[PDB]
Amino acid sequence: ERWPEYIPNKLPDKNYVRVFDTTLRDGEQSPGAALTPPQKIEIARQLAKLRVDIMEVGFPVSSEEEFETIQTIAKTVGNEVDEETGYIPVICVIARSKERDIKAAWESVKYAKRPRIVIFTSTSDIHLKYKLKMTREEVVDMVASSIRFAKSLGFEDIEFGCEDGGRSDKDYICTVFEEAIKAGATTLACPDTVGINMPHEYGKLVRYIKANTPGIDDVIFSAHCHNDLGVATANTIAGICAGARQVEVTINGIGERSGNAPLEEVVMALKCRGAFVMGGVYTRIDTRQIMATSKMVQEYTGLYVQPHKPIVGANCFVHESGIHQDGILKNRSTYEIISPEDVGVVKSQNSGIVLGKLSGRHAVKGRLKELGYEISDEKLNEVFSRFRDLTKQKKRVTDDDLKALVTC
Template identity: 55%
Template structure:
């Protein structure tokens, strides 16, 4: 339900991370009679970077970070692997700038550890991890925390060297090394005996520590199908070798919650030296149980959870950060022995939308927490309850996660007369603060859209305009104008004018099977890349005939053409050995579908051009 049906008021001295108390107080006579039960307390409180949490009382501050030790046994570290495991999703490719943007958003969200990538995978991956370590890994965020920057490596010196080179520039670097421990993996993939696997794991951890890294995480891959006694043995050995975090992956998502909880409890009880290491969970979603398994791990002693934004990842994906974090936020006090995290929920929705946009991975409408239907109510009975008291059918207020409904508590309507300062203030409220050139670019796009929109630009449309940014640092091509002629008679024709990187203007007019096809062919004639369109999706950002259209485009090199671009367009999963051609995704937003489509197409082609060009530069430097 999108209209203003709120039965609450908002008292705000700080929002979207600004310090101060932010509380939502229920205005209902029944609320007073009902008392402050678990649900009424939790749904009416919006979390800030400090101040009140889900139980309506001041949240404990985040404990000081020490590798292998958490001073408050109730605190759960959040380890985000969107940039590593999440990018392994089929079709997901992120540029270095996009990875940096996401890492910055994750840090603002309050993530404790950011796994920035798999540095050995390619020179570009190493460069991206290094860039995140230098920038995000050295900035102090709103609650005074500097995030740990982590790099993944297999259990060999070459991988570990690459990981250390990537993360060593961070104030708090971490190396995450792994080797498989299940019988099927040791026999079929590694072709190693259990004794050999233990020796390799110990050597890897010792080598990582010898480089000067005092924060080393070890994962026994496919722990869910491993013999528990063997897990106790190898984990005890790596702790003795210097591992500070023991991550337990349910790599194929085979475990049930009680089973995974027992596995964590057994590790806590039987691993020698466990008091000097933090137990972590990494749950895949093959059976749809990744969130439940992660919470079962927390209930049994795990104090780090590995997640991805929107649950993206290989196959069926990973544990969803927003689901795990909000579950702990809502139920940690009463059902998880007081467990809490450092996550600031008001940044969940903006971060989710950024990852969706950059990765090209759509969010299913009924996805918990961040899906389009998560706060929609169609049933008459539900609508009646919502009109009387939102607490009847919403256990989480959308504003808590940074999603503001069309008419909401923010109270500022953006239109063609709105100025730059108003836009800046609005973006801060929505959890996407901007300044400088980035703000100027969004402001210019906003004014163009606002001129054509009656009734102003709402929050969803404003976020779409933000997502419409190039996210390419130095675009090879810029779309100046696009004009189409089409109808029931004649041939659909598109004329596009584009500005090349060198400042020259190029014009092309091409006939197509429809207006969008003609526009794409006209762009192809100028850009000269031979690509295949693998996804084309148009969605209305809001309801109504004058809604902003958001177009998502995914392209990849045509078969045979990838050889001309270079081997780096191939994406290899070093864990499985599988190779696929990289895809490039972009979105465009406009009230005109043809314009939004053309913008998205040009951005996707620019991303491919930037990726290949940068890869050649990085490889040339690396080979010197």
């Protein structure tokens, strides 16, 4: 019940998975998702209520307003200790491997009790050729010296990520990571920045890096996956199975292009399946805060999730097809694997049964009973026939529609 002590490069046991939320950074990079300072601050406070281990709250060098907003979060959310449990979020900020960015990071985040910096540098041939116009040797010197610089400013909690790692040569990643560790990194991330990897391929990559990098046993490996081919969550899981013990996620999966790995999906996969098919890995997210966090982020960024969005979509605990309605009414475990209380979803007024074209007699019978009707089996068949006629005219049959079928 009490929170483990925080050591940047070590975890209390072999199953703890740190949840690193970057809704306020990678998530805000989604087109149309820019947030005002009060919105970022309210979201950060709610991410602490969700009990994320780390929240990455912005990019200090980007602007005065970003710099000042981070300071405010570092001074407030970053110093608020949960009295009973001692939970304190890590406040993280991102920087390119440049002195200007890194100085902006220290000066904005140093007020937090647990400040962290992420320094990122591209390692892929494509980025080195077209983006940075640097050689592999130059990139290694820049990674190491930027990390030494962050350490000289006062950082002890330093994360390094090889941008576009998913398209980087696996042995060059180990070389960079090895120098990153020697220079002071306590967490290493290998992001699939462009969302190209398949889960077995990403897991294979993580496993290889952890087998072939000197010193890497004594730092935390972090998965950071993007969703361009629809597998960000599974890539994250595969990273965990390959030995990653931090995962970087956003609320609702917002982020660049097709987004990041959704927090609520990675966290609920571990919650449902971690003990059974994943060797006992777990997080300490308070999953009952998921829906409140999802709703706040949707309203502030303006990116609303589709009806079939996992965990927090409108349709996740709703059933319209007769055979599924019938099973749910017999026992909800027939077609639901999660209890909605666990993710903050208020319980269905109607048990999640909605009536439409494809509904069955058990559903219709069930609803009529709720509305106070004691109808015989023959009368049910007559009402159901008229209910079917009605679904050609209207898409959703309301309680009042149902009452008129009986009454009229």
